[PDB]
Amino acid sequence: DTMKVINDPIHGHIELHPLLVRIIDTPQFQRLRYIKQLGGGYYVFPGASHNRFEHSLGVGYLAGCLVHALGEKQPELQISERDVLCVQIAGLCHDLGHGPFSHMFDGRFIPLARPEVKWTHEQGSVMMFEHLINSNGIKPVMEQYGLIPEEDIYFIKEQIVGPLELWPYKGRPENKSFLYEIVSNKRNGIDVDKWDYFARDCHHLGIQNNFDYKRFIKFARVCEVDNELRICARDKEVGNLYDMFHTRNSLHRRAYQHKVGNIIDTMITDAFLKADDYIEITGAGGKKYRISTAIDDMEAYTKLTDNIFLEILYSTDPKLKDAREILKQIEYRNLFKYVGETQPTGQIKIKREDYESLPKEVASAKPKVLLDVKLKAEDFIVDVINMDYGMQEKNPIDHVSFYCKTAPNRAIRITKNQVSQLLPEKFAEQLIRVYCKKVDRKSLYAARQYFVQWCADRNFTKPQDGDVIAPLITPQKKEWN
Amino acid sequence: NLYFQGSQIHVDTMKVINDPIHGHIELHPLLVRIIDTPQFQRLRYIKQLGGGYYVFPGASHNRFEHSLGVGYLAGCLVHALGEKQPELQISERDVLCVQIAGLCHDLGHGPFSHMFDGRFIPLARPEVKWTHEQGSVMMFEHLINSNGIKPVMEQYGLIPEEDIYFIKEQIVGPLESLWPYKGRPENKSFLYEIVSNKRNGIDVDKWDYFARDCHHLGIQNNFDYKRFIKFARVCEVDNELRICARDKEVGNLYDMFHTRNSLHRRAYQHKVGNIIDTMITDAFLKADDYIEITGAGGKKYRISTAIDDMEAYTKLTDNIFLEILYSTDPKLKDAREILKQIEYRNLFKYVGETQPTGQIKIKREDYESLPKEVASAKPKVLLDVKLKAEDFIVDVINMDYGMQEKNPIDHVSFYCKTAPNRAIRITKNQVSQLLPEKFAEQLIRVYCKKVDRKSLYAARQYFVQWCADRNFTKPQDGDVIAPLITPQKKEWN
Amino acid sequence: DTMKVINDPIHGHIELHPLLVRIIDTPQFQRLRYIKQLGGGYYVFPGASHNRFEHSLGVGYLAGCLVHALGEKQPELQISERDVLCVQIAGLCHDLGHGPFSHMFDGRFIPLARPEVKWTHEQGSVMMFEHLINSNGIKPVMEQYGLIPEEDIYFIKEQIVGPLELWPYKGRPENKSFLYEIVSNKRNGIDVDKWDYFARDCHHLGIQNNFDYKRFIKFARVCEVDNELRICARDKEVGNLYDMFHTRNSLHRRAYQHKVGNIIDTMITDAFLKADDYIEITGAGGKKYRISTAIDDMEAYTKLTDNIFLEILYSTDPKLKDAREILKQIEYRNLFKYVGETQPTGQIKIKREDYESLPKEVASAKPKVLLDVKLKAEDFIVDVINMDYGMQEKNPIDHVSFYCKTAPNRAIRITKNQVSQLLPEKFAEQLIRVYCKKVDRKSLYAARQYFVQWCADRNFTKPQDGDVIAPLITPQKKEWN
Amino acid sequence: NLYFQGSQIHVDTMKVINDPIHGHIELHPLLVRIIDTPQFQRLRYIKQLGGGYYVFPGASHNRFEHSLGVGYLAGCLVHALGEKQPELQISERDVLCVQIAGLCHDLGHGPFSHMFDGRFIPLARPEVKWTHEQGSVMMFEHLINSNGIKPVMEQYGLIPEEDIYFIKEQIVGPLESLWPYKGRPENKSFLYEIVSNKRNGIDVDKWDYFARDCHHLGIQNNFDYKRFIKFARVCEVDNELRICARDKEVGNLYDMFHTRNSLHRRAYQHKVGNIIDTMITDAFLKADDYIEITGAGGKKYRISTAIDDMEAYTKLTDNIFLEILYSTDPKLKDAREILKQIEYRNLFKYVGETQPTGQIKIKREDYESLPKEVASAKPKVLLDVKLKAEDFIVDVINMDYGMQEKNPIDHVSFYCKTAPNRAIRITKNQVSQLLPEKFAEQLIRVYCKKVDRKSLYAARQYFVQWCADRNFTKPQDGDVIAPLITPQKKEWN
Ligand SMILES: Nc1nc2c(ncn2[C@H]2C[C@H](O)[C@@H](COP(=O)(O)OP(=O)(O)OP(=O)(O)O)O2)c(=O)[nH]1
Ligand SMILES: Nc1ncnc2c1ncn2[C@H]1C[C@H](O)[C@@H](COP(=O)(O)OP(=O)(O)OP(=O)(O)O)O1
Ligand SMILES: Nc1ncnc2c1ncn2[C@H]1C[C@H](O)[C@@H](COP(=O)(O)OP(=O)(O)OP(=O)(O)O)O1
Ligand SMILES: [Mg+2]
Ligand SMILES: [Mg+2]
Ligand SMILES: [Mg+2]
Ligand SMILES: [Mg+2]
Ligand SMILES: [Zn+2]
Ligand SMILES: [Zn+2]
Ligand SMILES: [Zn+2]
Ligand SMILES: [Zn+2]
């Protein structure tokens, strides 16, 4: 068996070692052809037809690119072909755990269907990777190509999900710490996963990418920090790294958190909840699973992809009628109506245990207006969006090591004020979107009054269309004028 | 709300869609009403390039976004012609009609696009005459009737009986068997040259797919449609007003068809993409008796019969692949097994490619007889295995410039700088001596369904022997794959 | 005479009305083929070979694009073909006044050579446009195509430089105020000049553009503000407009203010100063002009382009030897050495009348270090760079009018806090770069100590390489650790 | 500073350059030393496409950035081959030598590139044999000697006497008149196939200019060089180790030469770009006696003689155009007048294009006689004016696949999947019946130096009459420009 070359529109011709080919050509990996990267986003951005499969090839490719580059520049690091393969495998497999419509599944559906489970796609990736290895006899193939399955499988899993349990990793020692900063960088978020998705999502969405990952690679080195050898960037690249996070935030603003993309994800999630009792997916030993329980059995989960949307849409089962009706409303573009967007003022954070109480609050607001209809808590959706630099309140650049021209082997730190005074004052905020499920002219006008009144009551920011939509409400607030 | 000339104005709010190919596309509300139906949205679930995605991972794109693009460009070209030549009397009505035809021209595609009408339906139901274009007409009629579009059409100045007919003609051509069109008369003949140009193949369908397939495949587009639009005019030709291109664009038009042929060679006819389409087709044939799709009046249809009922066909998309793959029914085991072999990349093995020599053409009626011929070859090679007709697949590919043996540029009208309203013709020899001497050829690919090392070695011998026997061209790897056969054919050396 | 089509790599096929063609095909316009858009930038970014000529075609094109779009959407505005042509002409001609190496000439050279003159390229554009009109008989051609030369020439000039002297414009009334917001927008800086240069500079530099001007055009309308009809953007486009200015700032950071690009511009300026007495350029009536005085005579200025660099480089005149030597040092890449970069702390601004005193201050600093050499004020260059959002301290988005979906004809305002809390706290800052003209190992080490000591003394920010370059200096400052 | 294996390591700091075509290019310090000289930096002041910039405003790019690109790709390809095949014993020394040849291959270009050696020098000094490639060898020798490069070469493991010779051979070919190279022996023959491939024209020079010219011109590149690199290997062929391409890449290689021909048709041979080059050449001829360029020992040279002294040639760039345009000397008035006419766009008028018929070829020795022939035509048309030989320009353009009448793919070696070390040949008929039947042709363009309406009308008649007389092909606008002539030629209808 020989290597294969794959032509990718983002990266061009990607070479795949035959061990990678064996892993790719399995039902557990090919499954990713059937899960859209951006989920409901495709229903707003028609170019965003791309699936997790090709993203995963790109992450595999870039992981190998970066590790090879570091090795070529610093032979003293003793990066081996074995190391390169392990990093490539982690890149290829980091997203094996995604479910139907990607973020929607672990971000919206599972928390609603089964509030007690701890589920993240990353956890799913580890479990699916284990299932892929065992179901396809990969361990002997790994051995043939110089890998040590016991150590290296563990290493791959650590690269994907982080520590499985002082140096907290077992797959590789401290003098190879930099290898853990490639696929999923828990220290500062600078990883090849982002580099592929910035480039790939932009290609498909029709928005242009301003981050240059190849430049980052050219300027990346390995430096000693504490007892570890870590990735270090050239000092004057700091501005580019701030802009990388800006880019990430803009893509969330323009595309990933698009108000309509999010409402479509919400409606699909609703249909899945209404279908969940009635859809059967066969797992190991012929056991039957639900959409929400397939995550417990990797054989069942293998067969759980975006196909579930069409299974529901095409169904005739009267038990599936409620679910089916919601999907039919998407097709006719009878979506829940966007009422508006607001933000908390001051240093107030909205806590996750409070999200479910918010539609109640909006319905319980008292707009001093001639209201032709009354709306209830169930008529409202309140979507709270956490926008940050990937580390809650923290500045990720405070967790980057740099090197200088005249001492390329010496790590230094660079603070925010050493860079620019035009950078963000803080690194996390919340956006609150409100929609109304009742879509007639009179319910919508009413929904607007409740919403803006609620913003007033909570001392939230004034909606941008506030004076046009709720003119009898905005004057009452003098903080807004 | 607002008034103009003393009358309330019904302002048409346009939706804007951001497309990676065309950028921001504005959609008139009538187009939006057509788009937001189950019959149109269906196209989100049918890959443009079908099995091609399994070879080119960027080619995830579906017929939906291609269709928006074709609608957009159709409008672009008609608008450009009308702004340059007000005397054509192109109306907003005409523009909407051409946009609608562009939007809807591919409504009739089935699962995996080309695979469905090109491979599956001809094998499943050999006596039906089905094309995706026919399917588009039927699906469009169904879309209109199921969603109450006719009043909306009238609201925006269309005359539905005339205009629906015109739209259908744009998609499929004349609706019968003099001027053959009823939707529009001869002084608007050019309107039929926009979405699907039957005269010479220069249409906006090609323009979108060149750009979009290239974007996704990771191959670069070398044709510039915007330039063509800039240089397009309308000229009187044989009692019609037809599209006419600037004379000096002739080289670019030859290159347009060269691009199309390159895209077929590199991507659409990729040997492995084709074998994947072939395997999916085989699975569908195996599943065909056992899949039920509910149509109108609750009637049940098969994959192959859903084309007879648009309510059922509405629900027939690439999803059928996963329905088969995920199935548990023992009746579906054979179909399911084939799709599983695709996932493991246990594909039929490519043996090679050859072509006929002289002016010999392989007849369509003889395709079925070819695997028998390969299996009946007698290679003077000692082999471990014997292969039968059923072990061979023979795929005959017709590569041309869209009009069989004919040069499409012979059917293009041109104008010259100093007389922009006068149509002329330009012959091949007036352009370049480096252009093709003929405009159609056949490629013959051979595969083996037995995939082990011994069987493939044997298939290579049967194949090259057959090529020698039939005086086909020497396979490119002939010296290496069949050293006991190739040196013995005197016309190969 | 017919229109012409030009193929441009940024905009594709641009149609040029025959009146535009007549203006383009003159020595005053074709001159722009010989002036690099980015000046010394080409010596750092080898793709940046592009000239002001093709940029000017693109600005002409986009100006026509925007005016046509507004007219098509709002016929009630009565935008005529005459208006479109006048706006296109202003777009084509807005940069006629640029001199050798663009920004370098009016930004660095003229202020040094002739400190008493008021010179800006925009002023030069008006003067060159007048010279183009008069020298090429354009007024009858304007008349032939429906223009009113007296009114329309004035209008074009106003679009380029602003008011030539309540409604302050004479070329067009208040109900066509939006026409003054196309080529050079003095109100908020949102204009087609930026749109071309973002796209074009990015194409050549090898950095990707993230601003979508075509999207802006799709969402642009004309709304009533006070007594004027002004350009108004859709409310939810506000984030994109903040990002437009971010983009502008990033391009300045990465490319236009590149530390080496700036030092090359500085050296070229020095050579021009040393050549200025000795270069003769023939103007009207055969009068002779200098590099610095050609700006006084448009006939002379017509012949003043990047060619002056090579005239100096290729010269044999012993009077030009000093100038020639500086250019020869550029060729051999013997450039002044970058010592570092710093910023003022607090709300301190460095005033323009203080720039010339700064090399003195650096030389007068007292580093408590074993210094192997002493450097003087003339050994130092101190480049102060003003980075802002185009309106000094002000937020340009406070000067943008918006419209909402449910009232497309009603202008509103949107404040910073209504948008995002991750946006800049302020909109202007200063960067201070220091270089040393003495390029040996010992002078450079010394230069570093003077520089960092000076930063300490002034309470400027700590240089990013501060601890590596000046380790015996950084500890003294506790504000830095 | 730092140590490794008990020895201080002289770390080679690489400069990085951001190029819009190739992205971030790393330059070894030896390459940097060569780049940072007046002889190299000179290339910043010579436009790649010369007069083409006056038709395509994006084509502002210069030979400098193209040269960096060629250096980069040369290194890329040699590195790729060496990593795939360690048995070739490609050393860092070899890699640097190929990079240096790539960097320096165009050092000999003059003002406006092709215009200078293609048009100007042949007219100014008909007996000299000058090519830009010869100029590159001379300029490289001058660069090395004037900047003390030989010690730097030794510092990085080069053997200057061997390696300078090798570099020169890469640029210009054999340095004399068996194995014809001294720089490297037969087991490194493939190294001569990288920068300037004399065997078949597949080299990295083309790869850079395809990508870069397209980027600037606003036409899209359809050739994928990175793919070619992925599929390139080294194979034994006739006692040499040569580059060999994967068999299935043959279609892409035919398309590479098709792309080159398209770029010549669309851009490099644009009728107006060519007439602008012609006018600039005319100005240079008029100025040639009066421009002085100081060379070595203070000797004075002309534009046409600067090629004889590299110190003077160093100072001869596109700047000569502006020196003429800005001049005040009355001796330069005629030259200056021509450049002024370019600025006002008072260009010579294009009359038309034709080609020979049959296998008739126009001989180079007969080009000079052609304007006389056009002026000696006798159109049966009543005209206001009479035109003489001096009023006509006849530009004969040779369009081929780089090897005159020969198919370059006949000189490419291929390998097959199942035997990657074995070289094979692939013939045209093994590929496609739609490929060119011949590989060279001539285009004949005619212009008139008299630009008024009456003179152009007349020129059109003389031209078409001449085409008829010589049995050349019918001009594409013949029906429109010469209705009194065209219908009377029976082989044109
Ligand atoms: N390039 C780009 N495209 C965007 C951006 N935001 C949305 N899009 C895309 C998604 C859609 O395909 C198209 C229209 O989206 P919009 O957000 O403008 O429309 P939407 O219907 O959500 O808003 P509306 O009903 O007008 O309030 O543009 C953006 O910031 N940049
Ligand atoms: N001409 C082409 N240009 C660009 N990409 C191509 C071209 N032909 C094929 N591809 C793509 C499809 C695949 O993603 C990748 C590899 O395809 P290809 O080289 O045809 O492999 P193959 O596996 O079909 O042939 P083989 O097994 O004989 O090497 O390149
Ligand atoms: N095939 C092509 N593809 C893309 N751009 C082209 C092509 N040919 C020419 N161009 C460019 C060069 C110019 O910028 C622009 C116009 O060129 P062209 O159409 O050839 O005008 P022209 O003025 O030479 O011919 P004419 O006067 O006969 O109309 O398009
Ligand atoms: Mg293969
Ligand atoms: Mg909307
Ligand atoms: Mg022309
Ligand atoms: Mg440097
Ligand atoms: Zn990922
Ligand atoms: Zn189509
Ligand atoms: Zn400008
Ligand atoms: Zn070259």
* DSSP assignment of C195-245: HHHHHHHHHHHT------HHHHHHTEEEEEETTEEEEEEEGGGHHHHHHHH
> Bridge partners of A403?
A234
- Tell me how far the alpha carbon of residue B132 is from its chain's centroid: 9
Which one of C13, C141, C310 would you mutate to disrupt binding with D, by most D Cβ within 10 Å of its Cβ?
C310
CA distance B331 to chain A (A): 17
So which residues of C are the catalytic ones? 121
d(CA A344, CA A384): 11
DSSP D4-43: ETTEE----PPEEEEETTTEEEEE-HHHHHHHSSHHHHGG
Angle CA D81–D84–D86, to nearest 5 = 90
Residues facing residue A6 across a β-bridge: A14
Ligand 1 atom nearest to A254, measured from its CA: 30
Q: CA quadruple D169, D175, D179, D184: dihedral positive or negative? A: negative
Helices D250-263 and D204-217: angle between axes, nearest 10 degrees: 50
C253/D488 Cα distance (integer angstroms): 68
- Of D208, D211, D206, D202, nearest to D231 (Cα)? D202
Name all contacts of D127-133 with Cβ < 8 Å and 24+ positions apart.
D128/D307, D130/D307, D132/D106, D132/D108, D133/D105, D133/D108, D133/D171, D133/D172, D133/D173, D133/D196
Element (H, E) at B459: helix B453-469
- Reading the block at residue B452, the tokens are 């082990």
Is the separation of the CB atoms in A171 and A154 below 8 Å? yes
Alpha carbon distance A205, A186 (integer Å): 27
Alpha-carbon distance B296 to C472, whole Å? 87
Element (H, E) at D236: strand D232-237
Which residues contact residue C86 at a Cβ distance below 8 angstroms, ignoring those fewer than 6 apart? Answer: C147, C152, C155, C156, C159, C171, C179
Q: Find out whether B208 and B258 touch, Cβ atoms under 8 Å.
A: no
C4 burial (CB, 10 Å; 0-12 / 13-18 / 19+) is middle
Rg over CA atoms, chain B:
25
**Per the structure block, which two tokens stand in for C93?**
């001609």
Name the closest-CA residue to atom 17, ligand 1.
A258
Contacts of C423 in chain A (CB under 8 A): 424
- CA angle, residues B176, B182, B187, in degrees to nearest 5: 130
Report the DSSP beta bridge partners of residue A411: none
> Could you tell me whether strands B413-416 and B240-246 are parallel, antiparallel, or unpaired per DSSP bridges?
parallel
Give the span between the Cα atoms of A195 and C132, in whole angstroms.
50
Closest residue, chain A, to B212 (C-alpha): A47
List the one residue out of C371, C430, C387, C411 whose CA is nearest residue C245.
C387
Which of D221, D225, D227, D259 should be mutated for ligand 2, with most atoms under 8 A from CB? D227
Pick from C240, C181, C193: nearest CA to C212: C240
Encoded tokens for B20: 């990676």
Residue of B nearest to A29 (CA): B343
Backbone angles phi, psi at B219, to 5 degrees: -120, 145
For residues C412 and B225, what is the distance between their CA atoms, to the nearest angstrom?
40
Q: Is B216 a catalytic residue?
A: no
CA atoms within a 13 Å half-sphere pointing along the CA-CB vector of A278: 17
Question: Coil, strand, or helix at residue B135?
Answer: helix
Cα Rg, chain A, nearest whole Å:
24
Q: Give the residue among A84, A63, A99, A386 at the shortest CA–CA distance from A194.
A: A63
CA–centroid distance for D161 within its chain: 28
Bridge partners of C261, per DSSP, are none
Backbone region of residue A421 per phi and psi (left: phi > 0; alpha: psi in -120 to 50; beta: other values): alpha
User: Which of B49, B216, B265, B272 for mutating ligand 2's site (highest number of atoms within 8 Å of CB)?
Assistant: B272
Asked: is B1-346 a CATH 1.20.20.10 domain? The reply is: no
Q: What is the resolution of this structure in A?
A: 1.8
Spatial distance between the Cα atoms of C243 and C241, rounded to a whole number of angstroms: 5
Identify the helix (H) or strand (E) that includes residue C386: strand C380-388
Cα–Cα distance measured from residue B349 to residue B278, given in angstroms and rounded to the nearest whole number: 12
What DSSP character marks residue C336?
Answer: P
Q: Residue C435 corresponds to which tokens in the numbers above?
A: 């270089």
DSSP C399-418: G-EEEETTEEEEEE---GGG
- Please give the CATH number for the structural domain made up of C1-334: 1.10.3210.10
Q: Is the CB of B347 under 6 A from ligand 2?
A: no
β pairing state of C401-404 and B440-448: unpaired
Inter-residue contact A412 to A329 (CB < 8 Å): no
Cα–Cα distance measured from residue B194 to residue B402, given in angstroms and rounded to the nearest whole number: 16
Q: Does D37 touch chain C (CB under 8 A)?
A: yes
Question: Rounded to whole angstroms, how far apart are CA atoms C216 and C88?
Answer: 19
Interface of D with B in 251-280 (CB under 8 A): 251-252, 255, 258-259, 261-262, 265-266
Instruction: Tell me the residue type at C283.
Output: G
CA distance B65 to B76: 17
| Residue numbers in A near D4 (CB within 8 A) | 76
Q: Which two tokens stand for residue A457?
A: 């009551």
**List of chain B residues whose C-beta atoms are within 8 Å of the C-beta of residue C215:** 18, 23-24
Report d(CA D437, CA B455) in Å as an integer: 39
Residue-wise DSSP of B218-283: T------HHHHHHHEEEEEETTEEEEEEEGGGHHHHHHHHHHHHHHIIIIIT-HHHHHHHHHHHHH
The ligand 1 site (C-beta within 6 Å) comprises A 44-45, 206-207, 254, 258-260; B 16-18; C 212, 215, 240, 405
Query: Does residue A378 contact residue C438 with C-beta atoms inside 8 Å?
Result: no
Q: Is A10 on the interface with C (CB under 8 A)?
A: no
Half-sphere exposure of D194 (CA within 13 A, CB side): 35
Which structure tokens are listed for A42? 């495709």
Domain segments of chain A: what residues? 1-334, 335-481
DSSP B477: T
The helix or strand, by DSSP H or E, that contains position D375, with its residue range, turns out to be helix D370-375
Closest alpha carbon to A52 in A306, A244, A230, A413: A306
Round to whole Å and give the CA distance between A57 and A98. 15
Residues contacting residue D265 through CB under 8 Å, at least 6 positions apart:
B251, D399
Please state, in angstroms and rounded to a whole number, the distance separating the CA atoms of residues A307 and A275.
13
State the residue for tokens 């193929």: C7
Of D106, A246, D60, B217, whose CA–CA distance to C203 is shortest? D60
* Structural tokens at position B401: 């410039």
CB-CB neighbors (< 8 A) of B68 in chain A: 46
Chains touching C (3+ CB pairs < 8 Å): A, B, D
Helix/strand number for chain B, H first, E second = 19, 13
Q: C13 has which bridge partners? A: C7
CB contact under 8 A, D20 and C328: no
Chain centroid to CA D257: 14
**What is the H or E stretch that residue D338 is in?**
helix D333-343
How many CB atoms within 10 Å of residue D472?
19
CB C312 within 8 Å of CB C323: yes
Nearest to A306 by CA among B65, B47, B106: B47
CA-to-CA distance for C233 and C397, rounded, in angstroms? 11
Minimum-distance CB partner of C5 among B2, B4, B230? B230
Pair of tokens at residue B201: 């193949």
For residue C215, the CA-to-ligand 1 centroid distance in Å is 9
Question: Which residue is catalytic, options A121, A131, A204, A252?
Answer: A121
CB-count burial class (<10 Å; 0-12, 13-18, 19+) for C168: exposed
Alpha carbon of A2 to ligand 4 centroid (Å): 9
Distance CA C352, CA A168 (A): 55
CA–centroid distance, residue C16 to ligand 8 (Å): 47
How far is the C-alpha of D247 from the C-alpha of B350, rounded, in Å? Answer: 15
Name the neighbours of D, counting chains with at least 3 Cβ pairs within 8 A. Answer: A, B, C
Token pair for C122: 């925009």
d(CA A235, CA A444): 53
CA distance B240 to A434: 57
Which pair of tokens denotes residue C108? 């660095």
Q: Which residues line ligand 3 (CB under 6 A)?
A: B 224, 227, 252, 417; C 5-7; D 55-56, 219, 266, 270, 272
- A354 carries a ligand binding annotation: no
Which residue's entry shows tokens 């919403």?
A: A451
Strand stretches in C273-358, DSSP E: 281-282, 288-289, 337-342
d(CA D142, CA D369): 40
A-facing residues of D in 77-136 (CB < 8 A) are none
Which one of D430, D471, D481 would you mutate to disrupt binding with B, by most B Cβ within 10 Å of its Cβ? Answer: D430
Main-chain phi, psi angles of A220, to 5 degrees: -90, 140
Q: What was the experiment behind these coordinates?
A: X-ray
DSSP letter for C100, please: T
Closest listed residue to residue A303, CA positions, set A291, A313, A315: A291
Catalytic annotation, pick one of D61, D132, D142, D216: D132
Tell the residue nearest (CA) to atom 30 of ligand 3: C7
Q: What would the two tokens of residue C172 be?
A: 């067009």
Specify the long-range contacts of residues A343-349, CB closer than 8 Å, at least 24 apart.
A343/A429, A343/A430, A343/A431, A343/A432, A343/A460, A343/A461, A343/C417, A343/C420, A343/C421, A344/A430, A344/A432, A344/A458, A344/A460, A344/A461, A345/A459, A345/A460, A345/A461, A345/C417, A346/A459, A349/A430
Residues of chain A with Cβ-Cβ distance to B64 below 8 Å are: 46
Strand-pairing partners, residue D19, are D23
Residue closest to B99 by CA, chosen among B19, B146, B187, B33: B33
Residues D188, D171: Cα–Cα separation, whole Å: 16
Rounded distance, CA C97 to CA C298, Å?
A: 9
- Least Cα distance to C471 among C438, C445, C441 occurs for C445
CA–CA separation, C302 vs A8, rounded Å?
Answer: 50
Which residue minimizes the CA distance to atom 24 of ligand 1?
Answer: C405
Using DSSP's 3-state secondary structure scheme, residue C289 falls into strand
Beta carbons of B18 and C215 less than 8 Å apart? yes
Q: Please identify which residue in the block is written with the tokens 């008796």.
A: B289
* Distance between CA atoms of residues B25 and B64, nearest Å: 14
Q: What is the 3-state secondary structure (H, E, C) of chain A?
A: CCCEEEEECCCEEEEECHHHHHHHCCHHHHHHHHCECCHHHHHCCCCCCCEHHHHHHHHHHHHHHHHHHHHHHCHHHCCCHHHHHHHHHHHHHCCCCCCCCCHHHHHHHHHHHCCCCCCCHHHHHHHHHHHHHHHCCHHHHHHHCCCCHHHHHHHHHHHHHCCCCCCCCCCCCHHHHHHHHCCCCCCCCCCHHHHHHHHHHHHHHCCCCCCCHHHHHHCEEEEEECCEEEEEEEHHHHHHHHHHHHHHHHHHHHHHCCHHHHHHHHHHHHHHHHHCCCCCEECHHHCEECCCCHHHCHHHHCCCCCHHHHHHHHCCCHHHHHHHHHHHHHHCCCCCEEEEEECCCCCCCCCHHHHHHHHHHHHHCCCCCCCCCCCCHHHEEEEEEEEECCCCCCCHHHHCEEEECCEEEEEECCCHHHCCCCCECCCEEEEEEEEECCCCHHHHHHHHHHHHHHHHHHCCCCCCCHHHHCCCCHHHCCCCC
Tokens linked to A325:
């009706």
Return all residues near C106 (Cβ < 8 A) that are at least 6 apart.
Answer: C97, C98, C99, C119, C120, C121, C124
Neighbours of ion ligand 10 (CB under 5 A): C 95, 193
Pick from B7, B224, B225, B230 the residue to mutate for testing the C interface (most C CBs within 10 Å): B230
Return all residues near D287 (Cβ < 8 A) that are at least 6 apart.
D303, D320, D324, D332, D335
Chain centre distance of CA D408: 17
**Is residue C450 within 8 Å of C367, Cβ to Cβ?**
yes
Neighbours of C464 (CB within 10 A): 22
Tokens of C261: 């690009």
C-alpha B22 – ligand 9 centre gap (Å) = 15
Quote the CA–CA distance of D46 and D42 in Å, as a whole number.
8
